[model samples]
Target chain A: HHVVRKAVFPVAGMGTRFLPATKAMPKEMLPVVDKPLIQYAVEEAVAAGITDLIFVTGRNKRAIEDHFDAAPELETDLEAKGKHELLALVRDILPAHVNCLYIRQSAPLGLGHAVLTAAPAVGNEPFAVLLADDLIDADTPVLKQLIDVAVARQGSVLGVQEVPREDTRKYGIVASQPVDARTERVTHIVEKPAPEQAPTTLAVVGRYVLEAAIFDHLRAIQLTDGIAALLRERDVYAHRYDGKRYDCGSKAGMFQATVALGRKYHGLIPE
Target chain B: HHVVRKAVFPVAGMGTRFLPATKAMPKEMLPVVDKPLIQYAVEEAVAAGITDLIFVTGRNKRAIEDHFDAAPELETDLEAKGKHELLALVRDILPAHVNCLYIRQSAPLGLGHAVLTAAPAVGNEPFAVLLADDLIDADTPVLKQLIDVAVARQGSVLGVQEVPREDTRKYGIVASQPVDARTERVTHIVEKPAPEQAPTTLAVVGRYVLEAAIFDHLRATIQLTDGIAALLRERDVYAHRYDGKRYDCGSKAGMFQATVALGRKYHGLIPE
Candidate 1:
């Protein structure tokens, strides 16, 4: 079985797209229906057998911590009021098995820098990195699928999904050959390449299961620089995992995530 | 059909039970699961065919208006992003036919005074008053049931549920005789009477469908006073023992009950 045990989340974006609302609120804390964007990622990580949750956070994000923390007074009050259902909902916010820890990114840095900030807590173990902005709704947790690929292939795994050529510029397009139906051997990575220049339609979304060596590359400044350099010596596999990914970084992405997940929560579909 | 077309929601309580948090935020805005308490009352009113929504609000409650009012910029951004699902949720908050009007209560007067504050807007017409605090979960909307009783009996109607005698001291106990299996002819009312002295176990919670003349009693400072004083001189009143359950205001238990009750909106099975 795959030995990935920890997950790091980068939730430091300014959320410039949501402006005034995001002025005091961290975009990650924005609720999609009931739970916040970050909670979905945390729940996904937990489902994927992750026991340690490392959050790379920025300023004015105390709500994130408070959300996970136990409000003893609130709990006591609810308990006394004979509202056991509500008491249970509040208590379930932070599950017992998962250990949550936070690291400050300190500056407005790029994705690589944010991941690198968690190097200390991650130690030397292989880990997963999830972007809170990319919400994936799938039967099998997307991170779990990536971890499975990493275990089966014994290499770094990238969560990729095929996008139309016209939309390739919006994502980090990957050059890959099919290993089988669901797996691919990734050869090169292009950051937001023009549609004509894209090698393949498979675009990398915000999920990764990487070896500890990725920390060295991340510390070297650019994310692509690290990924490109690692490709020469390491076997990197792209798993075109099955899922619907919502880019919560954009305004439309937020609503899309809210609607899809909200509908699911409301049981509109059989599943 | 009843002529009651408007509803007043008294949400002016200081919410002292949930202090520090309610110090800045109105308890009505506190979410019971996903939607806030005020939203639940609004949905209930809408379900009962209410066309006009009147809110008797107090300070630090502007968020209630913001929640119902459209966030046009947020909507435009969501539309440009092609998030039609979220777009629909936001747009559905206030129906086009339902006009939302707010009046400041100005002071922390009792619930009677809060209803009296709505006199100008509710002029000379029968109206419904909903307390944002008492969340009712029922198959047939509680207010709608009261409205039906009011139309048939042609008098003021109060939503009452049987409470144990020991708990009578906590609610406004009503002295009534059986009108039918589900209703009672309310002869008199006593506010928070001791269990031994309570005429009946029927406790008046917060839903009411009253005639326009009830305003005179509200102005005179006793809700039961005007009704009791005019029992023989004017029309009689009725209490419908409802099928729904009552969740009292601002108590931590109230929020819990509301959250659990509201969960049915999201899922058929109650979420633990």
Candidate 2:
């Protein structure tokens, strides 16, 4: 059975959509309910038995690293305050068994280049890529869902969903032939394909379970750039995950997530 | 026909209501909508024509200062990103005419002690004390409301409101005789008084236009409530029932309510 012990997180891009907010702080540090976006992604990966957290961070992303590490000052203060619930939550950000390694990306490149920076740590093993921006709240963690498919079939899998045709420009579109009831055999993959000259509306979400050979075709720079070649050699199935995916990268997306998750956790009802 | 030129922000003690959150970052840095609580307090002071801003900080409240100070790196980043709207907001955090002074309270004493730390700069002039926790949103800034009363009355003014008897213990309760329809002559005040021992239901809020003599009245580690009570012998202290929604950001529920209200005021942020 193939085990995904390492997960690659490409958190390099400057969140231009968030603008002044992200100017000083990383977008991943922005809270969803009380926890940040990256924490949710890390929590998802942790649920799937991931131990090595490889974060490919870019400029001014030091806070992301500091966040996962232990805060002795904070721990003692919480202890002094006797907030055991909040104290436990802070203490549990990084599990005892888990380890985190941060790789700095020198320049702004495609997510493919953003991910490949972790090649040294990842070595020759199947790894999962979870984008913090695409925060999907599912009954089962989305990473767990894909890990099931990857380990069972020993095949490459991309978590995808049917987005509207017009909105295809916002995602990496995949043209797939139905492999099973829930899975699809991806024939071709294109990055931000135009709506008119499109392949299919099966847009790739933030979750990806790629074979180690991905490092070979990965000079694709663009994530979808080399996936077409990956398909020629290996069977990459498009998985439709079950959950609500919140696009917390944009203002509209963050606002929506605040209202949705706020209602669920904080009892905030949107009018 | 006057102005309150100096404003004192008592941002010490790092209130532990939200313990772990306050440990890493000061509560003042936490955003209400997009801007931080400190920014709103600064905006209110600026609205009141305050030029000299004095911040009384304890332990780890540097983020409050960093926010008000210029961010050259952030400015350059926004400029490179071609975010014009973003550029303008970052540039306007601290205006050209204003100045900021940070005073540290080493003893970790009371609010009166916090203001005493500001005496070197405050000198012998009327200054406004705006607590970031008591966030009030109104057409006229609450500090400006206090400034108006302070100028017209030529005395100290406190921004106060009536809370239920049960809630009196949570705030400094004020015993005031009605001076006008919207103003009250504060006869006496007590800090954290129990419901049964309350003089009146009227509570003294965070907005204060204090006389320079306040520094003289403040002693030991006693609260500003006691200092204000002592200052009543020197001059009249009026309370203005300012027109606005007040959110005591000390509690999580208060901040939540402020966010929802402000979100809607953003041209249907939470649309019905």
Candidate 3:
């Protein structure tokens, strides 16, 4: 049995699009309905039995830490005033078994460096990396699906979904041999290839289940370059995920997520 | 100066239109963007310098009380964890000068009864009455504008906005002569008059600034009916033309309006 106990979330990007609002607050702290975007990711990780949460953060990201921690005075006042409804909300944010650790990435580096920054805390074990900017709402936990694929196939698994062939240049396209209805043996991976050069429509999303050895290649100039070099030497699979993803890094994506999830929160529309 | 230092918010109605969701939660607790509907009313009152807030509530309305109160445990945890951003949010809900009091209307009474129930706390003072079911977004505070009219005229003032002639039948129509561009000496007030029978398109939008003596007219019946009865007997009343639109609580249209207005509070859009 393979146990993936830890997950890394890199939230170091300066949210330039949201401007003045992000000037004081982290983009991840922006709420879709009641919970922040990062909270949704944490809940998803917790749902998948990820007890160790490592966050690679930048400046002005303390709100994320405060959101996940308990507010003792707030709790006491809520109890004294019999605010049991809100009390339940504050009490259940973090489970006893889960530990949240924050590591600062001094510079605004690439995604590969953010993941590498957590290598010491991740230790010599397989770990999961979840990108907060790419939010996925799925029936099955997306990361859990990848961890299962990793355990069953004995290799690292990348979460992927199909994009239109013309749109393949926007994402990391994957060339794979179909193993079954959902799993694939990834033959090659290309990041943002030209439309004509894209091998397949399957595009890599922001989720990964990687082995400890993958850290050694993170020093390469690019993450896709490092992963592509390792694909020839080791096992790397791509599993197509079934879910809807919102690219919250952009303005349009944020509005879509707000309207869609806001409707869901108000019970105006169904999940 | 007619100083109105208190306001009454009557939220005792069971929101039957909002169904299953309102089963456990009060409709006033329904959030627009970040703050709930009741919070909006409270903010309006606070902006107008009404320090004593009286809420007439019914059963299953405890959530409203908890929302405006301090959550000590949550605050402590936020402080310990260096969550100053969130900590400030929890710490500053109620102003130091403001006092919140809740009074239960044991029965499903009409608006007149709800106002009369708070007679004990409102003793010997002029006050404001704000209906949470009716929301207004204005450049100048609606109640403050009415209070200004009341203090200048030394009489009660009702906040009125011009509705379409066809929709006049849906609200309390006011018959008055214009004393100024924005002030009117109200001659008569009729509730839900027919379109043609309406004296003017100007209609009352559920906001009032009155003297405490008006409590004597709240005689176990309709509030406007009693007010009309007292109009001939006591002090004069005027209608102030407010500079905003009304959002009826039981409509989906109102929810959208609130969401859009609240989005502006977060600097989501520029004021139009």
* Candidate 2 backbone collisions, by pair: none
TM-score of candidate 2 to 2 decimals: 0.50
- Chain B TM-score, candidate 2? 0.94
Error of 3 at A203 (Å): 1.1
Q: Provide the RMSD of all predictions against the true structure, rounded to 1 decimal.
A: 24.4, 22.1, 24.6
Per-residue lDDT of candidate 3, residues A195-252 (tens digit): 8899988998888888877788885556676678768777889999888898898999
The prediction achieving the highest lDDT against the true structure is 2
User: Quick one: RMSD of model 3?
Assistant: 24.6
Can you give the lDDT of residue B138 in candidate 1? 80
Worst 10 residues of 1 chain B by lDDT: B220-229
Task: Score candidate 2 by DockQ.
Answer: 0.01
Using TM-score, rank the candidates from best to worst. Answer: 2, 1, 3
